[PDB]
Amino acid sequence: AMSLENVAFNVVNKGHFDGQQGEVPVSIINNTVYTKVDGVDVELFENKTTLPVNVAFELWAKRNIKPVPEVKILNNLGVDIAANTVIWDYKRDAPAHISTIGVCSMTDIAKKPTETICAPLTVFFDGRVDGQVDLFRNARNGVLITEGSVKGLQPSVGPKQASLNGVTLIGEAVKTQFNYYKKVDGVVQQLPETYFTQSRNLQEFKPRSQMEIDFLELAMDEFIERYKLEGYAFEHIVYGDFSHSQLGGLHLLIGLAKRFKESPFELEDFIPMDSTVKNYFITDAQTGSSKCVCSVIDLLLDDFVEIIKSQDLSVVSKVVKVTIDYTEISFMLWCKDGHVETFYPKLQ
């Protein structure tokens, strides 16, 4: 027996929806859910979604609290809906998916993913839940994650990191690296070879290779010399050029993290959502150098070096396609006299 008061009871006593019986007094005002605690109203939830406040509150309470794939991975794999869970999108403060299956009476399109309404949708299945590997085997369209091997199915090793309650982390106490599987029209897909973005933050950026440690510690000319990067325009692309009114390059998160230690800058996240490539309106506070659309990707510096060193540098401009997070990312590569001028994730 689902109810607003029961959802609020679960949030108050269990920190989230935990199927417990009970009710607390609730008041809804505008887009906020409150509960009465000893005579006064205490805020439980502020709706930042486009769904009705009581519906968003229920989906948020019913969010998956285990490490789950980051929303950008699910989106890149064409995931439409999740089987009997809510993947909460912490970047948008909203459900990752419009509809649900066996979660909430207002958003449910089905109670089980075997209902014919789900057959054309790519349903997310989680092998850590009993019966979901079997549901994926019988589903026409779906994406499955598992911690280990699935008999007969060939896996795709996913990223090392996963999202746990909005914290992206590489699990030590929990497993965050999943095997991925995908089916389109009843046929198990062969997921492509892919690089993965590292999902790091600017303020707490940590290197994940000796090359990344060297990038952060060494001076620009020492690093470029050590890794034989002359002619690859890392001065522009990675370090950034703050000498003109338009900020040059600065498309790799590691370069922004290095700059951030020396001096701050504003990053306007004008489309705030999870995506493989992010676009920011950047203003460098020290110089006043700025760029309306600065595309930024967090690749491991070694992967970015491998990508740029695997390109033909004989044409003025061309599109370089790279599978990253299972999706095809277009980069614009500009060359002159056999050397790179710029290389950036395409603002298409």
Ligand X SMILES: NCCCc1ncc[nH]1
Catalytic residue set: 236, 251, 291
Q: What backbone phi and psi angles, to 5 degrees, belong to 336?
A: -155, 125
> Considering the complex, what minimum distance in angstroms separates the CB of residue 104 from ligand X?
18
Q: Which amino acid is at 157?
A: V
Q: Specify the residue for token string 């990067």.
A: 229
Q: Is 337 in the site for ligand X (CB under 6 A)?
A: no
Q: Is 85 in the site for ligand X (CB under 6 A)?
A: no
Tokens standing for residue 143: 């994406």
Q: Is 80 in the site for ligand X (CB under 6 A)?
A: yes
> Considering the complex, what minimum distance in angstroms separates the CB of residue 80 from ligand X?
5
Nearer to a second copy, 88 or 304 (CB): 88
Residues 259-318 that bind a second copy (CB under 8 A): 264-266, 268, 270-273, 279-281, 283-290, 292-293
Q: Is 78 in the site for ligand X (CB under 6 A)?
A: yes
Tokens standing for residue 282: 């950047």
DSSP bridge pairs for 327: 324
Tokens standing for residue 67: 């490490």
Q: Is 117 in the site for a second copy (CB under 8 A)?
A: yes
343 to 231, 260, 308, 321: CA distances (angstroms): 12, 22, 8, 12
> Considering the complex, what minimum distance in angstroms separates the CB of residue 293 from ligand X?
22
Q: How buried is residue 324: exposed, middle or buried, by Cβ count under 10 Å (0-12/13-18/19+)? A: buried
Q: Is 271 in the site for ligand X (CB under 6 A)?
A: no
Q: Is 182 in the site for a second copy (CB under 8 A)?
A: no
94 binds, among ligand X, a second copy, none (CB under 5 to 8 A by kind): a second copy
Q: Cβ distance 33 to 44 under 8 Å?
A: yes
Cα 4 off chain centre by: 30
Q: Is 48 annotated as a binding residue?
A: no
Nearer to a second copy, 311 or 342 (CB): 342
Residues 34-53 that bind ligand X (CB under 6 A): 38-40
Tokens standing for residue 237: 């692309």
Tokens standing for residue 105: 């009476």
Using the contact rule CB under 8 A, the part of the chain among 35-43, 144-152, 210-218, 323-331 near a second copy is 35-43
Q: Is 70 in the site for a second copy (CB under 8 A)?
A: no
288 to 201, 237, 246, 247, 291: CA distances (angstroms): 23, 18, 9, 9, 10
Q: Specify the residue for token string 């789900």.
A: 118
> Considering the complex, what minimum distance in angstroms separates the CB of residue 106 from a second copy?
5
Nearer to a second copy, 21 or 310 (CB): 21
Alpha-carbon span 295 to 330, nearest angstrom: 11
Nearer to a second copy, 26 or 82 (CB): 26
Could you list the residues that contact ligand X (CB under 6 A)? 38-40, 75, 78, 80
Annotated binding site for uracil: 291-295, 342-346
